[PDB]
Amino acid sequence: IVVDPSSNLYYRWLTAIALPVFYNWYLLICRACFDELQSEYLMLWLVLDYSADVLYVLDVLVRARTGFLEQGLMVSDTNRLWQHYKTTTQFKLDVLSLVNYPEVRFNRLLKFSRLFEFFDRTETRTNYPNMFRIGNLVLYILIIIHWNACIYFAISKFIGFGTDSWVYPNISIPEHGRLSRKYIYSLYWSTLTLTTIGETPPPVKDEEYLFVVVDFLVGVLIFATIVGNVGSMISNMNASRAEFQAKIDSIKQYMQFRKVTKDLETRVIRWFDYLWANKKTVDEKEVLKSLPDKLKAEIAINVHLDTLKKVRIFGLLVELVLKLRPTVFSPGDYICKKGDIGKEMYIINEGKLAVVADDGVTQFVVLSDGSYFGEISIGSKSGNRRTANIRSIGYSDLFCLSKDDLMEALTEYPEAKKALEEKGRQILMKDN
Amino acid sequence: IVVDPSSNLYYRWLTAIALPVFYNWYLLICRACFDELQSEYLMLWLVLDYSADVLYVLDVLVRARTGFLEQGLMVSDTNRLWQHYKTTTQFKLDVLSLVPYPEVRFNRLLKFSRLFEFFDRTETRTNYPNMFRIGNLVLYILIIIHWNACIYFAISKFIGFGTDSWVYPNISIPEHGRLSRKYIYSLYWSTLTLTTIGETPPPVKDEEYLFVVVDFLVGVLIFATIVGNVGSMISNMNASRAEFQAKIDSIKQYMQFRKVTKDLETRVIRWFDYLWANKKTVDEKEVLKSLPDKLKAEIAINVHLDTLKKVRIFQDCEAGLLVELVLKLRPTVFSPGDYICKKGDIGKEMYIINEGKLAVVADDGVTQFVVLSDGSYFGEISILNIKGSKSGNRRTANIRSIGYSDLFCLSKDDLMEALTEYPEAKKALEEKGRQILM
Amino acid sequence: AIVVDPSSNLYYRWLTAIALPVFYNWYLLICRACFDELQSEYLMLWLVLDYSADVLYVLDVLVRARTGFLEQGLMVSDTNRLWQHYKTTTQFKLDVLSLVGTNYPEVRFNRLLKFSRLFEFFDRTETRTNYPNMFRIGNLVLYILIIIHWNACIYFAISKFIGFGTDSWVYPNISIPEHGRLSRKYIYSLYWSTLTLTTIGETPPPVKDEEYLFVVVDFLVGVLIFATIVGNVGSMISNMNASRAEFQAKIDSIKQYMQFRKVTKDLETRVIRWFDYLWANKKTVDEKEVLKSLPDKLKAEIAINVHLDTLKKVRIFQDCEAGLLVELVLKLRPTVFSPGDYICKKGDIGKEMYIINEGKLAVVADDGVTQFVVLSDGSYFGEISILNIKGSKSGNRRTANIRSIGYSDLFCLSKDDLMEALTEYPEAKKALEEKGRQILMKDN
Amino acid sequence: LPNSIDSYTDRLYLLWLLLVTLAYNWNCCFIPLRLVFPYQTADNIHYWLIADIICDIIYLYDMLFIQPRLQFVRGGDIIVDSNELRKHYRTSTKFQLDVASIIPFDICYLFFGFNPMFRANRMLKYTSFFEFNHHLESIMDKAYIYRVIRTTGYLLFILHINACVYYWASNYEGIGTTRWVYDGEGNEYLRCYYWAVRTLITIGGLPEPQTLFEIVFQLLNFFSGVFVFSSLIGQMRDVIGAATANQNYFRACMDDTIAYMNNYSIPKLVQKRVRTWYEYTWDSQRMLDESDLLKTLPTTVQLALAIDVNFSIISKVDLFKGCDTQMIYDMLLRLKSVLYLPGDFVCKKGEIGKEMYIIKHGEVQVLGGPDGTKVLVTLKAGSVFGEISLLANRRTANVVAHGFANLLTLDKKTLQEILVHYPDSERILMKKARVLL
Numbered sequence A: 001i002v003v004d005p006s007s008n009l010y011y012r013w014l015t016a017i018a019l020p021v022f023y024n025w026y027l028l029i030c031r032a033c034f035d036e037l038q039s040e041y042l043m044l045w046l047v048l049d050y051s052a053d054v055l056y057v058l059d060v061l062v063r064a065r066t067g068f069l070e071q072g073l074m075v076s077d078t079n080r081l082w083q084h085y086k087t088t089t090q091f092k093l094d095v096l097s098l099v100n101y102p103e104v105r106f107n108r109l110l111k112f113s114r115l116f117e118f119f120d121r122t123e124t125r126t127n128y129p130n131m132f133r134i135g136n137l138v139l140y141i142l143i144i145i146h147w148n149a150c151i152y153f154a155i156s157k158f159i160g161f162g163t164d165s166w167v168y169p170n171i172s173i174p175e176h177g178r179l180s181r182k183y184i185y186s187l188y189w190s191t192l193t194l195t196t197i198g199e200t201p202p203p204v205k206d207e208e209y210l211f212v213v214v215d216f217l218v219g220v221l222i223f224a225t226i227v228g229n230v231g232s233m234i235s236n237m238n239a240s241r242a243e244f245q246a247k248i249d250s251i252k253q254y255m256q257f258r259k260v261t262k263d264l265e266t267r268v269i270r271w272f273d274y275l276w277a278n279k280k281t282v283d284e285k286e287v288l289k290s291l292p293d294k295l296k297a298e299i300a301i302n303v304h305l306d307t308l309k310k311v312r313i314f315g316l317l318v319e320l321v322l323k324l325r326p327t328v329f330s331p332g333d334y335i336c337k338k339g340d341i342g343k344e345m346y347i348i349n350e351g352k353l354a355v356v357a358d359d360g361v362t363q364f365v366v367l368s369d370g371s372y373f374g375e376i377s378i379g380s381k382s383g384n385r386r387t388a389n390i391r392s393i394g395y396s397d398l399f400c401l402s403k404d405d406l407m408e409a410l411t412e413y414p415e416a417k418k419a420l421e422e423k424g425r426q427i428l429m430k431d432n
Numbered sequence B: 001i002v003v004d005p006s007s008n009l010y011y012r013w014l015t016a017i018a019l020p021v022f023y024n025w026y027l028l029i030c031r032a033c034f035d036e037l038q039s040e041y042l043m044l045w046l047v048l049d050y051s052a053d054v055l056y057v058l059d060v061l062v063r064a065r066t067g068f069l070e071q072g073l074m075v076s077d078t079n080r081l082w083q084h085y086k087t088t089t090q091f092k093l094d095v096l097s098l099v100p101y102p103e104v105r106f107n108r109l110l111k112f113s114r115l116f117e118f119f120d121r122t123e124t125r126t127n128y129p130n131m132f133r134i135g136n137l138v139l140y141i142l143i144i145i146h147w148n149a150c151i152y153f154a155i156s157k158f159i160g161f162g163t164d165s166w167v168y169p170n171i172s173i174p175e176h177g178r179l180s181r182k183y184i185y186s187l188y189w190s191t192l193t194l195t196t197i198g199e200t201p202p203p204v205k206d207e208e209y210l211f212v213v214v215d216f217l218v219g220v221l222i223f224a225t226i227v228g229n230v231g232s233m234i235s236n237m238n239a240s241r242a243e244f245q246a247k248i249d250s251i252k253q254y255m256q257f258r259k260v261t262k263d264l265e266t267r268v269i270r271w272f273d274y275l276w277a278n279k280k281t282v283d284e285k286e287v288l289k290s291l292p293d294k295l296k297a298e299i300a301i302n303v304h305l306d307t308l309k310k311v312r313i314f315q316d317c318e319a320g321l322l323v324e325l326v327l328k329l330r331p332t333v334f335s336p337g338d339y340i341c342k343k344g345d346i347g348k349e350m351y352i353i354n355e356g357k358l359a360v361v362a363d364d365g366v367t368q369f370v371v372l373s374d375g376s377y378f379g380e381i382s383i384l385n386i387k388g389s390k391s392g393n394r395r396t397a398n399i400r401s402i403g404y405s406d407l408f409c410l411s412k413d414d415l416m417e418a419l420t421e422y423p424e425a426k427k428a429l430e431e432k433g434r435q436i437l438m
Numbered sequence C: 001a002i003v004v005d006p007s008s009n010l011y012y013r014w015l016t017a018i019a020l021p022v023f024y025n026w027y028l029l030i031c032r033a034c035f036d037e038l039q040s041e042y043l044m045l046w047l048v049l050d051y052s053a054d055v056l057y058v059l060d061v062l063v064r065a066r067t068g069f070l071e072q073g074l075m076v077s078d079t080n081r082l083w084q085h086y087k088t089t090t091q092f093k094l095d096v097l098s099l100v101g102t103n104y105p106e107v108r109f110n111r112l113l114k115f116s117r118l119f120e121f122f123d124r125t126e127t128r129t130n131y132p133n134m135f136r137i138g139n140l141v142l143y144i145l146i147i148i149h150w151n152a153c154i155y156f157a158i159s160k161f162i163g164f165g166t167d168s169w170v171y172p173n174i175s176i177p178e179h180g181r182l183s184r185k186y187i188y189s190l191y192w193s194t195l196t197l198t199t200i201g202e203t204p205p206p207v208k209d210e211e212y213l214f215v216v217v218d219f220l221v222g223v224l225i226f227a228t229i230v231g232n233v234g235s236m237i238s239n240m241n242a243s244r245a246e247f248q249a250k251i252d253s254i255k256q257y258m259q260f261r262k263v264t265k266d267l268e269t270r271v272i273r274w275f276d277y278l279w280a281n282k283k284t285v286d287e288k289e290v291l292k293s294l295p296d297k298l299k300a301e302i303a304i305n306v307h308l309d310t311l312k313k314v315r316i317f318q319d320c321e322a323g324l325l326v327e328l329v330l331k332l333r334p335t336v337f338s339p340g341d342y343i344c345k346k347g348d349i350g351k352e353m354y355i356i357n358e359g360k361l362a363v364v365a366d367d368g369v370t371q372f373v374v375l376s377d378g379s380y381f382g383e384i385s386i387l388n389i390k391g392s393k394s395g396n397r398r399t400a401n402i403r404s405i406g407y408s409d410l411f412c413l414s415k416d417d418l419m420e421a422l423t424e425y426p427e428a429k430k431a432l433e434e435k436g437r438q439i440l441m442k443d444n
Numbered sequence D: 001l002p003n004s005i006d007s008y009t010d011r012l013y014l015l016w017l018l019l020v021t022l023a024y025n026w027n028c029c030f031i032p033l034r035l036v037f038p039y040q041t042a043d044n045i046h047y048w049l050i051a052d053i054i055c056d057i058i059y060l061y062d063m064l065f066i067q068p069r070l071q072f073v074r075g076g077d078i079i080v081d082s083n084e085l086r087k088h089y090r091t092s093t094k095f096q097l098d099v100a101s102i103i104p105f106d107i108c109y110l111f112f113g114f115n116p117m118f119r120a121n122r123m124l125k126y127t128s129f130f131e132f133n134h135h136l137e138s139i140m141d142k143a144y145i146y147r148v149i150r151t152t153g154y155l156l157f158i159l160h161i162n163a164c165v166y167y168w169a170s171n172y173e174g175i176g177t178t179r180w181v182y183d184g185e186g187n188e189y190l191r192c193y194y195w196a197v198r199t200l201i202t203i204g205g206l207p208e209p210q211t212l213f214e215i216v217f218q219l220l221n222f223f224s225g226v227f228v229f230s231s232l233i234g235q236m237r238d239v240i241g242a243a244t245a246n247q248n249y250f251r252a253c254m255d256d257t258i259a260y261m262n263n264y265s266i267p268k269l270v271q272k273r274v275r276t277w278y279e280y281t282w283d284s285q286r287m288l289d290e291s292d293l294l295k296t297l298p299t300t301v302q303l304a305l306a307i308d309v310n311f312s313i314i315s316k317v318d319l320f321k322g323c324d325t326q327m328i329y330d331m332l333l334r335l336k337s338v339l340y341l342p343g344d345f346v347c348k349k350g351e352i353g354k355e356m357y358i359i360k361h362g363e364v365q366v367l368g369g370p371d372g373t374k375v376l377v378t379l380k381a382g383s384v385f386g387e388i389s390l391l392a393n394r395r396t397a398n399v400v401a402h403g404f405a406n407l408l409t410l411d412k413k414t415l416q417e418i419l420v421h422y423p424d425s426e427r428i429l430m431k432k433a434r435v436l437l
């Protein structure tokens, strides 16, 4: 057997090893600082520690018998795999890890790297990354508050219960002799100390003074860090929406400075409402330039042939959809007025447009998702211009394309070259 | 009949239905937990709850008659609207928020999406987006503080009033027994718990210990949300001033490190202060590129065509060259006393004077020959021409500014792309041919 | 006439050995002047440490009179010029003011004036370190331990001026053996100072009006300075990610684009596997982006000294020259393609030329996966359709189908960058042209 | 007192803006204090009236005289005449706000009690206060200490307003009646300011409020204290970050470069060479590069800054004289400053030359002896080398930097592009090449 780190089996094993490391950190500092859960029910810690021990040695076997990506290929030679694993600090920590019995159980905490690999893999893999970031920083403040609650109960056990007012009170009293009372009061003191709140009892000895000073300074820096990253995450949750409202506000400030007319004001605001409520508010040319060009062209052929498998006369478009550049035209706008110069051609995708001749009247035909706008402008007594009025009837999208770009993508297709020139000359034959 | 989801009739319905949702949430969790409200203002809550039922039923009717787009055209087929509304999940939420102790109205508090949609479309629509983000934030934290206040009073009613210390005190006494006293002390408790101040009486039972720990952790995450949010709102309110002051101290620190001449520092610093006091410090094309092409032409056409109809190309009706020019304008302001074109040198552009006061001067000292005002266009000699009576492609004179002049620019290749299929290339040629004679 | 340059290791070792005395003075002169039992009990330890700090301060004057500076590029060496540029500066007057019975360090407060040497040490350690964000977090922790300790001593001086146990706010009456020990005095006054500057306040409330004014001034000094501290510590602990957050934002925008545009699940997990590969093999830093600021000699030097595995094996690099090889790798940019995809097809245009570097991809036939020959690192392809072959059967058309067998780190190189490279180096250029022409004769 | 006071080149106008902000800040700091505290008794009432008359005379003298006597820009040109600028200040909204400010309520002071609430209409000069703070911020050389002092002044002012409202609430409920209120027995302003710190900072530890008005006051004070603490402290952290932005950007770029070189394999001598390059460019540039900061300016002011520094440097030298000054202007525009670490070669013999260099603040050397070790000439700052770019091509000698040299590059493409515009200078520099063979 051999497995790669991209495998869904490997992610499922990262889940099943993310369970007992989290168990071991949380309940092992709770056991080794409380010394009442053990003496109440040892047997659950026997069966859970046996399960965590066999999952740790199975993680040693799976981290032995997984492979990597050397020279672009996965590696299956198991003796060199064992030598590569044996020269690694992760296996060094694992044989320092796998040497009842809460001291060697406390030695079984050193496999945190599986939990960090779980957090990366889930942070990339999920479709609720924000859920994950809210969930793992809530997990980090609960582990910090739990370890500080158990450190407080160990300091109170080292001083003595109820010797003075700072420590836990006397456990001969049956109200302070419940394990639920011990854990939730030490958690409440840990919350009051770590979140810098106050209304604790005031300390009256020197180790209590040094510990409350160290705990308040760790409380300020841990409060700042972990409950400032939650502020950065919950204010980076709406980020592209914040950039879109930034674009809206900036355009509205420029229009309220420049004293523009009210119909243009509400047309621009309704264009912004169209781009918000139609969910097309992501600018793909700016946020999708950092991808490499091959996967950029692969997602281009995928989504553009999924929208555009309604191809005209010439099937196989692997070179013609390279530089499709969409633009959204508002309803009531004219694509080209009656007699203008022509540079670029427009194809229709998910739009419904129509032809005019006197700007509003003379609808000859409505237009489906088939053909071009600028098959003429690219002898027949004509050339290099458009002679048809095309008003945008609805909220359409239309790709634009360049003549030199289609010519240099057309040098491999002479059949499409002669088909395009023949259908443009045939359109001039039915027009002039 | 159909409503349009962009129109102001649907936005007035959005404001008229954002009221009962906010009433429902706020007064709902007040009424279910206090019970002096429920047993004392019963006719008022019955009138307001009948109004909330009939506005939820009219909201079900509006979403059964709303419109939605299909390839740029909205659907007027009401069977298609009702079938698409039945297939989406907002109808299932809108029926589960209307099926008949207000546990019935706890079922009714389920239309949460409409208040978020109202806040979103008001953040789009209104002219005070930072004020509306401050108001949205303040309403969110007041809803959290009010809900936690009613949860604390229900925990005190479930344990028993005045038996313990951390619980709200005994209601038999007339001090802490009025309903205004109950609600104001309970909201005082929850603002001290949620903003991590904690001057409250400490808990004495383990259930109250657990509730205070859960309440403090929810409160410290709410404290982080309002610190980051309010700080980001004030920084985005002063973001233009912050970026302009970063540009000012960047330029000023660079020039004071370089030991450059002090009147030149004062000239460029007052130039930037002119650019901020004219509010032109953010550029046009960097936000009109987020605008599309036809709307960029429509936002550009009116001001620049009205200031380009004063200048001397307005003789005949060749406005396609003018819309090709005003799609290609580069507005650049000039400090007073600064020469635009020094004489006899290279020329890469043509200029349109818009709200400036210019003077063609002599070389050594300033002797004003002619005063070019708004309405004069200049710089047309640095394009292709005959010999005439002058030399080649250079600058024929010295032109400086008198005051702070705003200038449109027309570069070479943009004028060549705009300078096809029109006789005003030849008309500008004969006008500058007369100028290079005289 | 031995000058010390300010960039050497000897100057930095001297900044460590002077950065100590200054921190000992700033940490313990206010503490010896406030807690009087530290001056009363211990005397010989402060005598030995204070004589060592005095001789190190006079040694600091003797080093700064003989340090160099950068004037017209070259390091100056004339020690009279060094002493003149020392003595016409404010640091000379601050050092002679810093270097002006045996129970009073209240005249010894003037030796706190080498804050310049302490900040010079922290700037040179923050340059010369290897863990910069860990050292800046340690620097801000050292600043708040200085401020908390200084305010603890200021609180005990105010309590000694008012009178111990006179009222509830001050330190209590020190004739009691509980409150009387020196360790109890310092740790309780540090507890009061952390509780004031941190703004918690489990402290007793003040009584006298001078105590009210001190607690108002101390809470405002706490709020402003700890506002600066918690803001800069939070910005440092958000700056310690710096590449894991931008990458996560880019994969969040990619996955929002995937769930919006309804791209199919196999290609969705393909781009998931691509971004997992680029993070896990740590090629997420873009070389020409993060070295956009360096000059050409440093960019050429670093592109030798990271791409020598390319440089020692490629047949272009088999007989060319050093300047040709460094302008080529300086104009070379690395990509990586997923396995089983098409880098370049049969019939297309020739835009880029490609070099194998820790990749293993074979040239394939027109349909299917039938390997012709594998091409390991050192081989290259592209040159026939990039450079204009005169004896060719076609022009600007690729002659074979090339797919990727493994995850191959490859080098794009444009025709424009290649013709800019081959300018007055024609011998290897025609050697590659005859190589491409003879494989064209094999390749019809 | 002229008719034309320059708004930015007059220190006496800035000192007058200091006097009108002292007469504004007196009202906005001592209206509440006089309104709620017993400091305006029958003894010091003429002292407070002399201060109010002095600030009202500064108000009236400023608003009548100084307001319409500065100079402003309208219609593209600077305005210098008196009557049109007087009508401009009349048609502004600032004059309407200032006559809304000064309503002389002394007729009601002689009728209806000495009440500073009648004088509290004089706190409507935020335009003059923010004009003062903008003028002092754009005049001051290191403005990051003044923005911090302005935020600390805002914090001490909002604490002063909360201390006055706390003493008003205690004086409305009766002083010392309950346990929440102020009870007397000391300095009244200091104990109420202690309350305003311990509430607005959200510390706590006060007495607990007892009745309805003090519970809703402590609740609204703590809530607005959370928001104004997290707003003005966030403003403090923002102005400190905007201060430390240049060094933070430089540490970010050097952090990414040294982390990249440690992430890959690069030896420690090249690591030391790259970090001493960064050390020298911060100790001599205080910036990362100049091109990102300079290229966001317009063309004539970029030409002015570059021509002032580098055309004074190239007008020291006369090797390129007898030539077109406009060619020197465009060549001045198209330069890039490049650094060279001491000991290394910028160009070796046998290489292709495609640059030209003019050394500015550096010292380079040539090496063309028996093996390129004997230094022929040492060109100091204000000399030139190149000429293989101009010969229309291998390199003659080994040019090495002696110290931390700083060179201005000049490319072969742009150099031939500027020399094919001007033929006479091309002839003169070709004669310079023919005598410099």
Ligand SMILES: Nc1nc2c(ncn2[C@@H]2O[C@@H]3COP(=O)(O)O[C@H]3[C@H]2O)c(=O)[nH]1
Binding pocket: A342, A355, A364, A372, A373, A374, A375, A376, A377, A385, A386, A387, A388, A389, A390, A427, A431
């Ligand atoms: N002239 C013309 N163009 C039409 C008509 N119907 C559709 N079209 C398209 O409209 C066009 C507008 O741009 P083009 O000149 O590029 O080419 C024209 C045709 O492709 C019609 O009846 N007349």
Ligand SMILES: Nc1nc2c(ncn2[C@@H]2O[C@@H]3COP(=O)(O)O[C@H]3[C@H]2O)c(=O)[nH]1
Binding pocket: B341, B347, B360, B370, B378, B379, B380, B381, B382, B394, B395, B396, B397, B399, B432, B435
């Ligand atoms: N020299 C000159 N140019 C003028 C005059 N009136 C208008 N202009 C324009 O001003 C110009 C400034 O730039 P150009 O040299 O490019 O060309 C010149 C003319 O087009 C005039 O009286 N003299």
Ligand SMILES: Nc1nc2c(ncn2[C@@H]2O[C@@H]3COP(=O)(O)O[C@H]3[C@H]2O)c(=O)[nH]1
Binding pocket: C344, C350, C363, C372, C380, C381, C382, C383, C384, C385, C386, C397, C398, C399, C400, C401, C402, C436, C439, C443
């Ligand atoms: N056509 C072809 N190219 C090959 C072969 N083996 C290696 N190559 C290289 O693969 C190439 C792909 O790009 P080019 O057309 O630029 O030039 C071709 C050759 O340099 C082969 O068998 N056929």
Ligand SMILES: Nc1nc2c(ncn2[C@@H]2O[C@@H]3COP(=O)(O)O[C@H]3[C@H]2O)c(=O)[nH]1
Binding pocket: D366, D376, D377, D384, D385, D386, D387, D388, D395, D396, D397, D398, D399
């Ligand atoms: N060859 C040479 N160059 C010199 C001498 N003195 C100064 N220089 C400059 O040194 C140069 C080094 O670079 P270049 O070849 O570019 O051009 C050469 C000259 O400009 C000299 O004696 N010989």
Ligand SMILES: *[C@@H]1O[C@H](CO)[C@@H](O)[C@H](O)[C@H]1NC(C)=O
Binding pocket: A160, A161, A162, A163, A170, A171, A172
């Ligand atoms: C707790 O109280 C009992 C008697 O009430 C006493 O014997 C015991 O010593 C106390 N515990 C401690 C730790 O002192």
Ligand SMILES: *[C@@H]1O[C@H](CO)[C@@H](O)[C@H](O)[C@H]1NC(C)=O
Binding pocket: B162, B163, B170, B171, B172
């Ligand atoms: C609470 O109120 C009831 C009402 O009569 C009273 O009997 C009881 O003693 C009160 N409890 C306390 C603790 O005051």
Ligand SMILES: *[C@@H]1O[C@H](CO)[C@@H](O)[C@H](O)[C@H]1NC(C)=O
Binding pocket: C164, C165, C166, C173, C174, C175, C176
């Ligand atoms: C402190 O205690 C001693 C002995 O108890 C006493 O003599 C002295 O007066 C006390 N001082 C004060 C200020 O209480």
